[PDB]
Amino acid sequence: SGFRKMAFPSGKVEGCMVQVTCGTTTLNGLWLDDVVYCPRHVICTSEDMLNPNYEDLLIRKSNHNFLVQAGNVQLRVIGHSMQNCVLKLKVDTANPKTPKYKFVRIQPGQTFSVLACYNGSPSGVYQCAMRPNFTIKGSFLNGSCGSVGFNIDYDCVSFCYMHHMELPTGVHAGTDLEGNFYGPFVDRQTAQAAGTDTTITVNVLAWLYAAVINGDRWFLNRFTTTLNDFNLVAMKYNYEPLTQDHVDILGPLSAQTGIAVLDMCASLKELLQNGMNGRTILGSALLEDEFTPFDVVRQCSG
Amino acid sequence: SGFRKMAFPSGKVEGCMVQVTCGTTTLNGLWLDDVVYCPRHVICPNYEDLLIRKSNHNFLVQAGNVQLRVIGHSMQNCVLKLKVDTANPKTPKYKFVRIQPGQTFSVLACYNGSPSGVYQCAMRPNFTIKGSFLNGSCGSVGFNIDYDCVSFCYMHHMELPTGVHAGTDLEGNFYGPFVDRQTAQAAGTDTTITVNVLAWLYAAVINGDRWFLNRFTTTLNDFNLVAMKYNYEPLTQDHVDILGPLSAQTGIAVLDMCASLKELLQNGMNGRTILGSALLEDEFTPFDVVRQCSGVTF
Numbered sequence: 157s158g159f160r161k162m163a164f165p166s167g168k169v170e171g172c173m174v175q176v177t178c179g180t181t182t183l184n185g186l187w188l189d190d191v192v193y194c195p196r197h198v199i200c201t202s203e204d205m206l207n208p209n210y211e212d213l214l215i216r217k218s219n220h221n222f223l224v225q226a227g228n229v230q231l232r233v234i235g236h237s238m239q240n241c242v243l244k245l246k247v248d249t250a251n252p253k254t255p256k257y258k259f260v261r262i263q264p265g266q267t268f269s270v271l272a273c274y275n276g277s278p279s280g281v282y283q284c285a286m287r288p289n290f291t292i293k294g295s296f297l298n299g300s301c302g303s304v305g306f307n308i309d310y311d312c313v314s315f316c317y318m319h320h321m322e323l324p325t326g327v328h329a330g331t332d333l334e335g336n337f338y339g340p341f342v343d344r345q346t347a348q349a350a351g352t353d354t355t356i357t358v359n360v361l362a363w364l365y366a367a368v369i370n371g372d373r374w375f376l377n378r379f380t381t382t383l384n385d386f387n388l389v390a391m392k393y394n395y396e397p398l399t400q401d402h403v404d405i406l407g408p409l410s411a412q413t414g415i416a417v418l419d420m421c422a423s424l425k426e427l428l429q430n431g432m433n434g435r436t437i438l439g440s441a442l443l444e445d446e447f448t449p450f451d452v453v454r455q456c457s458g
Numbered sequence: 459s460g461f462r463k464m465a466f467p468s469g470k471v472e473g474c475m476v477q478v479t480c481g482t483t484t485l486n487g488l489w490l491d492d493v494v495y496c497p498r499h500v501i502c503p504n505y506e507d508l509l510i511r512k513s514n515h516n517f518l519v520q521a522g523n524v525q526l527r528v529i530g531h532s533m534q535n536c537v538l539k540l541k542v543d544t545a546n547p548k549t550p551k552y553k554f555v556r557i558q559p560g561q562t563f564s565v566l567a568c569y570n571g572s573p574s575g576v577y578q579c580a581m582r583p584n585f586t587i588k589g590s591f592l593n594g595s596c597g598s599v600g601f602n603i604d605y606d607c608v609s610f611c612y613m614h615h616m617e618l619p620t621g622v623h624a625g626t627d628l629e630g631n632f633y634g635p636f637v638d639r640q641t642a643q644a645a646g647t648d649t650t651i652t653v654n655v656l657a658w659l660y661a662a663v664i665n666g667d668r669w670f671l672n673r674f675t676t677t678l679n680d681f682n683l684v685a686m687k688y689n690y691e692p693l694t695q696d697h698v699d700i701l702g703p704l705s706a707q708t709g710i711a712v713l714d715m716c717a718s719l720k721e722l723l724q725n726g727m728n729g730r731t732i733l734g735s736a737l738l739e740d741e742f743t744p745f746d747v748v749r750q751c752s753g754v755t756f
């Protein structure tokens with residue numbers, strides 16, 4: 157029993173965190189095998205960030221300009237290449253702590269753990285979700301760039317996010333590990349803003365099923381809804397449209413609890429209308445949207 | 459910017475998690491140097507009588523795909539200490555510390571000696587933890603990290619009927635009036651950790667949310683009279699002193715933040731949120747707020 161926002165154990169990722177310095181700029185790098193991955197803006201100064209020509213800035217650098225520090229050991233850079241917004245620094249030592257890993261690009265609504273790092277040293281771990289507007293509501297200060305987001309599937313680390321910037325609303329933007337930004341963001345200090353964010357409907361429903369599994373049914377009702385009527389109501393509260401894929405994905409939780417997905421949708425519609433009336437659901441007075449159907453099944457069952 | 463419920467990096471603890479099996483019971487053990495620590499109920503009660511009937515070879519300890527050989531066993535309060543022939547080469551710098559209610563720690567939830575998740579939680583004033591544990595989670599540990607030293611403060615033993623959890627320090631002393639047996643046990647009436655709510659209000663101010671601030675102040679006694687009415691823990695001069703740094707950084711005296719908290723208790727949030735929460739959050743200590751809002755690393 158109990159339902160917590162649970163991060164993956166960070167050990168496999170901690171053994172990959174390194175410090176990358178280029179000139180006056182210091183950030184974090186991810187050392188996997190003989191390559192250190194880091195944001196390409198490590199080659200920029202603050203002035204360069206308005207309209208940086210990364211190809212032009214990078215061609216002026218040599219291997220020895222990049223100082224890579226793994227613990228108290230300086231790694232030697234023997235090559236460098238840029239792939240989208242990520243710099244790949246070839247080093248002369250393969251990381252003996254390299255876990256079984258893969259690079260995965262996630263979709264909005266997906267969750268992941270973030271190992272926040274400063275100067276190549278892990279400081280904390282928390283759970284995040286890729287917002288529908290492609291930002292993450294992280295906890296990141298200056299020096300956190302290069303910190304990564306991941307999931308662990310059996311013994312395999314799936315790296316899905318690398319931190320690049322904080323937008324003016326305090327939310328965060330980054331790339332997958334191939335350097336492709338999530339959303340319409342660029343690694344420039346040009347005027348950029350997160351789009352209007354919305355609630356991840358499929359995740360709220362997953363969390364309502366988690367509440368039912370843990371013994372809370374106060375919010376259920378005798379009603380059902382069509383998917384279209386649910387979406388018409390949902391959109392009015394800035395909730396993401398629920399697709400047939402989402403309904404299919406919620407099938408297992410629907411079967412375990414005996415509550416049809418559209419029956420849970422009617423409950424959600426009523427919660428949006430009435431609020432909680434001084435009550436809580438899994439210790440929360442707000443509808444929680446950073447647990448996926450997969451996270452609920454993992455935490456409530458195994 | 460941002461404020462998350464943040465756990466310590468769990469790597470130093472992950473390298474200590476082992477599986478302990480005795481008969482039909484499988485749970486988790488903490489392998490530090492040549493000793494594996496686990497709940498004494500793995501032998502299940504008259505624990506001295508149950509333990510004397512066991513031999514070393516009855517305890518199957520598995521560290522990854524390697525079976526460790528138990529060469530001795532002893533009980534300390536509600537923890538079983540299994541002496542093994544191999545010292546854990548991954549043993550971090552560590553200490554066993556007993557925490558006070560209101561103090562927070564990270565929990566590395568484990569099943570079959572394998573870490574599955576990490577989350578942050580607080581020792582409630584009623585000595586329970588609002589954890590997330592399933593069957594097989596016994597032996598999972600709570601910890602804090604200071605510099606490079608892991609301070610182990612909790613070992614999971616049981617779930618109470620309300621779904622909250624009970625355990626011991628690493629010396630096997632239970633937190634709370636709990637006992638390790640299948641019997642009628644219930645968590646006492648819980649209270650809110652006042653110093654932690656104030657720490658979280660300071661974190662909200664640091665993060666740019668000031669809507670709840672007011673021009674008013676209060677006395678410590680008047681604040682405590684109001685706080686007692688709302689099942690909040692009394693705020694002591696120690697708590698006020700501990701909040702000194704956050705008070706200086708934001709320019710809001712601790713009793714000035716107390717007046718804001720008094721108004722939040724008597725009037726609610728009025729459709730508003732604080733750090734994305736419609737409830738007053740009490741599982742961040744003043745130190746957790748400073749650490750997260752300064753980027754301390756390990």
Ligand SMILES: C[C@H]1c2nncn2CCN1C(=O)C[C@@]1(C(=O)Nc2cncc3ccccc23)CCOc2ccc(Cl)cc21
Pocket residue numbers: 180181182183197198200201202205296297298299300301320321322323342343344345346459
């Ligand atoms: C590494 C950092 C640097 N360090 N010394 C020189 N430079 C120059 C390059 N740097 C940046 O510009 C990083 C920066 C950024 O967003 N950094 C931050 C990230 N996360 C959380 C933060 C919290 C507080 C302050 C800054 C934060 C600063 C703002 O503007 C942008 C715009 C586009 C991009 Cl891709 C990145 C950035």
Ligand SMILES: C[C@H]1c2nncn2CCN1C(=O)C[C@@]1(C(=O)Nc2cncc3ccccc23)CCOc2ccc(Cl)cc21
Pocket residue numbers: 157482483484485499500502591592593594595596615616617618637638639640641
């Ligand atoms: C390890 C477990 C065992 N497994 N197979 C044989 N045994 C015998 C010993 N075991 C217990 O009795 C453990 C138990 C307990 O509380 N276990 C649990 C812990 N955390 C979360 C849980 C979620 C769902 C169900 C059980 C959970 C079960 C209930 O009653 C008590 C009462 C006193 C004590 Cl100290 C422990 C327990």
Ligand SMILES: [Cl-]
Pocket residue numbers: 261262263266
């Ligand atoms: Cl995905």
